[PDB]
Amino acid sequence: EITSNLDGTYADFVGLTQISGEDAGKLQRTGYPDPNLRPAIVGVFTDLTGPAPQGLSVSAEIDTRFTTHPTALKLAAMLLAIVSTVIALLALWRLDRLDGRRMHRLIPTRWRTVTAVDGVVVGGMAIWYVIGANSSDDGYILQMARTAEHAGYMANYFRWFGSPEDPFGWYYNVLALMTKVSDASIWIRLPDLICALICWLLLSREVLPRLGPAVAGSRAAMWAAGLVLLGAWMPFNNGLRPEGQIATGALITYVLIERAVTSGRLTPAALAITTAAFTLGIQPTGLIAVAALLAGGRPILRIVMRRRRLVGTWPLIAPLLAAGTVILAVVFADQTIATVLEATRIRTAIGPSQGAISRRVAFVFTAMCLFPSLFMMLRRKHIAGVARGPAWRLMGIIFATMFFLMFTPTKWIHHFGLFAAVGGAMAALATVLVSPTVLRSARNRMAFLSLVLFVLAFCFASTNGWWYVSNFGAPFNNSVPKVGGVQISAIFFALSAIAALWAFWLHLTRRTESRVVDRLTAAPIPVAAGFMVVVMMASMAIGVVRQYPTYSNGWANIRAFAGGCGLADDVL
Amino acid sequence: DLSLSQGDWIAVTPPRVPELQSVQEYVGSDQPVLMDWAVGLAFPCQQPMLHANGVTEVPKFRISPDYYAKLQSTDTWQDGINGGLLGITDLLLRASVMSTYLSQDWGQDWGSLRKFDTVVEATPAELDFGSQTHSGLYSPGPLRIRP
């Protein structure tokens, strides 16, 4: 008999004495006490054929840690925790209505006033949803979503030892439920369209009026928010890599904490707690929602201290920590804490333990909008038209996520997906800040226009290369974009140096009043974002119409309605 | 062979007119395939080698991305040294890449398609299962990982 346990591998010959060596009691107990040296069972193979001799029986126990389902107790506990937290939330809503203020005139008056930017960032978002590029890990998410229904434990299919990335994967269960119906690329990416639409419809109608009367009054501000939204949304999260949902959830918990401050209630804050928990639940790079909850924590705690006098302190903090912990009911649906810590220690054991024309956009749409807006918000202590409170919380979200997501968390750098939502509104903050009515000095505005053209030169330097199959027939997938012989990066660097010297001459002469600058720098952020949006949508439009009778991303998504495969139909 | 260098040469085989068929025609939605991590969204119809309670179905084909991404990014992500599907299929199956051509775009490395072939008779297993085990937080030992 041969064994290979956890503390096994002692393949012993019962009743046999060794001929050379020591006798050690003459039992032939030989092996190594080690779980490290175990076999990898792919099956069992022999050459002998015909009826089994009595004694021949290989009966191995396979690894079955994660393929589990909860018993009756754990299911009843989940249903009771869910109904108890919704009872606690509606009890908080009942208790909180002591200032009156009933919900009257649903869909507020600043909504339903649709304008041209809404039609643009809806139509162009739909056109990008059809013909646009996918993410890098689109197949990585799709394949494990397809197999997870039959396997029944959300396996991280490829890399680790069938380990469930069930420490944080519930959104993949939403995709897995979605995959019960046909899994065409036009249809399974429907959350990336829906969260884009509700992202825009929150941003234009509920974030920007909250940000102030100035940002709402200016058309250029809403136009910049729309084009920066669309420009940040279209490269990164129009696949299945779930960074459009994290952006949307961070926007939801920000606008809910805004609702909680502006209304003087606590139930939007209590919903923002569990929403931040769910968006933390989507990915470990969903810490932006926690960052938003922290950087809107001080007014919430003021509202707590405000309602502490009237009611008890304990029935207000209790539903907050309830909605904070109900994430555990959904995340630990079929995974015991033992198995998640086992998946964690495999992922840290062998995983990673800590460059294109429109993938280096991240430097364009936060790194030169949030920094000038920050400097303007600092220099001017009270501006006219910008609400200082929510504007500073909007800054704090983008800054605070960097200091425990960009440097400390291990997720490949170069991310722009997440800041597609809230860094969209940051641009709307920036454009009214650098507008000619707020910035009085023409020197600073001309230097900012030079910064715009320098960053656009930095962005166009690389090759117009999309991740895998989007890259089918692109203007400059192989080389640097060169319109008219010399590269367009040189054109932006020449115009940036022209604007730089035009700014330095105003620094020396000290003009501050030449109109030419006013007419030139009137809203440069939406002009830059419009150029990036147009060059990307042109890149992919030339991609689809260039490679028309063969497989493009757009022709595949259109032909998916006809019941055809995406790439399989035309690979001979 | 106009080249005096030792690193230059060519080989030639006579021309043919191959009997081409689409992937969906040849590889239907019955045979499970090992779709690599970079290409799942492009191939939506073929079901993958779905696994059930710790055992997988034996894969028949390995649809894979372009050569450079296949060599530098994909295969490093899926090998036996760190988990991987190529721990089990390379140990069992024999991969033999075929010829594939992207239609009306000749000169584009779309990817590859490798036909697996078994090495024995390889009947599918019976797999007698028992399902009564109710642990609280009892994880029996660590899995086998690299040393």
């Binding site: 107790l73 754990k74 009911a329 998640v340 | -």
Partner: peptide, 28 residues
């Protein structure tokens, strides 16, 4: 009120205790 505070606190701490206990429960 005095009819919503008590249900808010018992359901609050009940949801807390139940949700934190959800990882350490039996599974088949």
């Amino acid at each position: 009120v005095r009819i919503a505070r008590w249900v808010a606190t018992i359901a609050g701490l009940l949801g807390f205790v139940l949700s934190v206990s959800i990882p350490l429960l039996p599974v088949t």
